[PDB]
Design a protein around this nucleic acid. Sequence first.
DNA 1: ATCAGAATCCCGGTGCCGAGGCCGCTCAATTGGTCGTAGACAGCTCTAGCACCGCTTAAACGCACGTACGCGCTGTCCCCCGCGTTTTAACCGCCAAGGGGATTACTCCCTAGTCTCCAGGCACGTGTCAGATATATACATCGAT
DNA 2: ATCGATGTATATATCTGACACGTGCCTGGAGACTAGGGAGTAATCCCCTTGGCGGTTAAAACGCGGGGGACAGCGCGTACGTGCGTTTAAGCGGTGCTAGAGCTGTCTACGACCAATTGAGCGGCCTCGGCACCGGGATTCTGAT
Lengths: 103, 105, 93, 95, 78, 83, 97, 97
Amino acid sequence: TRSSRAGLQFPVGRVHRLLRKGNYAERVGAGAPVYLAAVLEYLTAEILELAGNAARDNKKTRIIPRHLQLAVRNDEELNKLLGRVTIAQGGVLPNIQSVLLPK
Amino acid sequence: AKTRSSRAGLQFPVGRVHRLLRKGNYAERVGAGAPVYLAAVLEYLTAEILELAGNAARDNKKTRIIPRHLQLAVRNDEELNKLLGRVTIAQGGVLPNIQSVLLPK
Amino acid sequence: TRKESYAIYVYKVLKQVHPDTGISSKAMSIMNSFVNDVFERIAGEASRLAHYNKRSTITSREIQTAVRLLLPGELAKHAVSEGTKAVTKYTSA
Amino acid sequence: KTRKESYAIYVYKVLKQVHPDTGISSKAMSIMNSFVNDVFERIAGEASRLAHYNKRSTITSREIQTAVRLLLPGELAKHAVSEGTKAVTKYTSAK
Amino acid sequence: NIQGITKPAIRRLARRGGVKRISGLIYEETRGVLKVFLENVIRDAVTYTEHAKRKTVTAMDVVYALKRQGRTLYGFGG
Amino acid sequence: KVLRDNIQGITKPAIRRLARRGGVKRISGLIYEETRGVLKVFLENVIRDAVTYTEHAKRKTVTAMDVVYALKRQGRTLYGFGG
Amino acid sequence: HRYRPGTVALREIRRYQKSTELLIRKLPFQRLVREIAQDFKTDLRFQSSAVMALQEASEAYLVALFEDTNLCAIHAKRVTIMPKDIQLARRIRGERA
Amino acid sequence: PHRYRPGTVALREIRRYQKSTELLIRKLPFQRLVREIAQDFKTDLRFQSSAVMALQEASEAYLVALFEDTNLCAIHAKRVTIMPKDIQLARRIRGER
DNA sequence: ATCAGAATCCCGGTGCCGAGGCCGCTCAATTGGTCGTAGACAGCTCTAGCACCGCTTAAACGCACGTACGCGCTGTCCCCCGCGTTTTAACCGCCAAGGGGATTACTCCCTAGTCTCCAGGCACGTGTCAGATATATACATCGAT
DNA sequence: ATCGATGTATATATCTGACACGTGCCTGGAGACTAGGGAGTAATCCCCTTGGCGGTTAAAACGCGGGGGACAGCGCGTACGTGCGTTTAAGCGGTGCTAGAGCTGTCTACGACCAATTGAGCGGCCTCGGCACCGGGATTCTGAT
Ligand SMILES: [Cl-]
Ligand SMILES: [Cl-]
Ligand SMILES: [Mn+2]
Ligand SMILES: [Mn+2]
Ligand SMILES: [Mn+2]
Ligand SMILES: [Mn+2]
Ligand SMILES: [Mn+2]
Ligand SMILES: [Mn+2]
């Protein structure tokens, strides 16, 4: 393969196919499906990281959408990135505005 | 006539719109009516706006459309204004609108 | 070198619509952008439409439905009629 | 019974790489797949304009790179580029 | 039919919204608001269906509509 | 030569004039500094991006087009300068 | 006995932000969706995922909206949200005119 | 002598600056600022004079759009005077950070 | 009520330089003909969606009752506006220098494209446990006192 | 704070459907290998960007005095939250029926690719008339008396 040759888990072939057929440019370099597959791989790790963390924190061995949302919205950098994405079955973070609290 | 524009009975250069659509990686291939359509739609809109800008110019007593005139044109038309709801026109200025509660009674 | 521009067409249409009226360097420039913006906007959204429907080619059907997504009503409607008119006309000649 | 693709299995392999003793649900799996396609388009699309803007016909790792630097927040980009430049050189080792 | 969007349901949403106290006219306001939202999303959605020559609006039309409108949603085939 | 404190070039009258085109009549004193803060987060975005385009185009000169592309990126499309 | 007005309110907030379940029951919603669409095109069918997608998109949106609404209420030294907040919220979002 | 009452010249100036389109920030201070911020990203950068002018055009539009929506926030809290907290609400709602 | 001056609104003259025009040069579109594959259409297939039916069961509802919040009024205190004088540096149009963009010019490397061979990734298969479900207990409250 | 008292969390027993893992076919990827054109790189000119200086003054700064708004206090009236019992249709589990979407194989209409041919459209140059700038005068209205 090339996932191997690049130490990647993410399909370096698939990616090269998609770049070419998905109408981004006339021609497509050899480094790019590798560079990109890696960045996709990097980021899917960062999410799986903190979501997993979250599933531990929230006492479950399996990640459901919530654990993603929790991971994402609690991360300052990831929440930005997905600043315009509604994640199905995510709920919201718990935040109860000060002056609403009892005295 | 030679010009594909004339076959189409248009001002916009259908040849140019065809070149760009190809040197633009929107698809493998391009139909032959798609440039025509698009060149015509582009024409509709530049007309629709130049109509309102020139009127805008006229009231401000002017022979020549300057951006304020395009701006006045755009934000007075509910629809154009929405199409360009995210667009700064250089030298556009803003529409004269002063909130009520700031006016003397 | 050649800097291509819609400056002649924009003029043409202006002269068609307000025959004793000039346009300034900046205004032209502005206009010039507007055409390019709407071009990409349409073009791109047509490009998505081909793609979404496993399809290799952008035909005026695409460009049309692109227009129906992009533009507000009265603008869209007129633009559509306007456009499909020029197709028809172009076929016949 | 059509053969529609996804990233499902690689997500897992990466899941194992980070959290070996942990699992996932179908409902979250689509989210991870949606996530991947979305990120793919945004980077690819940025890359695409980059080429055009520069009157050039090829999307290289360099395009893909700067695209990332426009699409990602300071820190997240930082690592991405790292992991990106790494996987590339490592791949150009082998042949 | 629209008024089938029950007051209690709207109450729940505002609670998940962080909202503590609710005026009466909110409920109706919520409704016009929600209507406007769906209309726009369904107008775009259907357009995709009409263009796919289908009598059945899919998830992907919806998904595509939301993207168009800057309200991207995950978990229905991205 | 070294450049320091330039945000204070955004004098209080100006930050005022803008607010007037903005339809504001009464300006609280603590506004001026906030506006400067905001304008900064603003330019730090358009130029972080403009500059990337400039780095990518392998240039030492930032062009009107790198700016215009940046704005478009951040959904603040600008007409009047090319594009 | 009796709980002091606004204290189950706080309790319900806690409950719903902890849960991810949908809050408008599926069928009124489903019938609302079909109504609105028939207005655009006749004799149509919806994928059950198509309706869920819509529902997720709509709710999440409204919640987001109540959040931002509730902040305007608070901005006006109030504690009750009111149609006039929603209007300012959407105005500033640029949704409404 | 003579003295215009408070808020009288404000209203005048509003009408002034709403008639015109010329930039409100001074040209020179502006440039100095932009060079600074850019230097602190990458040294040894030059600017097309029109590229400064682009950023300025874009900057003012934004702040004037901003003041607009800030001003609405003041008027929401039954005030007439804009305040940092107003600006802040507008940016939370715009979804700026 | 009436009066003054301050600002804006408008007037003509005025001097300048940009838009608009004409002229000639070249590059991007036109023309025409081939060739190859996308898409369209027709013919069959089975999957997803719609429909109607009825049981217990939560959720919707409707009213009741009182409380605490919204809102309108008032008064105080103070900050932010206006103005005038002092102060500072923007703007203008003066020239002078060379870094850098943009245009040019040649060779070759990297990628698109074709083919043939090979397993990585997918539908689909089951058995299995993580976890939805809960009933009784453990706790961490809230309101009354 | 201290009461008893909710309603909430935590628990540990059992039940069941989606997970995760394996079966094996297949279609997308990969290795071989040709072909050329995009773009790298090195050479050359020619814009425009920076820099730097004083003549000029419009804009900024700074202080001063008080007008009128921020906001704090309050005081009334009611528009919501709470919560019992009172009314509906949401949902679930079950089967029935087909429209429509999915897949498959064929033919030709249409679009890329290519070459030779030329005025549409561009820059380069030229001129004067729209309009920006200066300066005078009448119209308005705001605030002082
Ligand atoms: Cl590459
Ligand atoms: Cl076509
Ligand atoms: Mn610095
Ligand atoms: Mn009087
Ligand atoms: Mn040099
Ligand atoms: Mn106590
Ligand atoms: Mn080249
Ligand atoms: Mn049928």
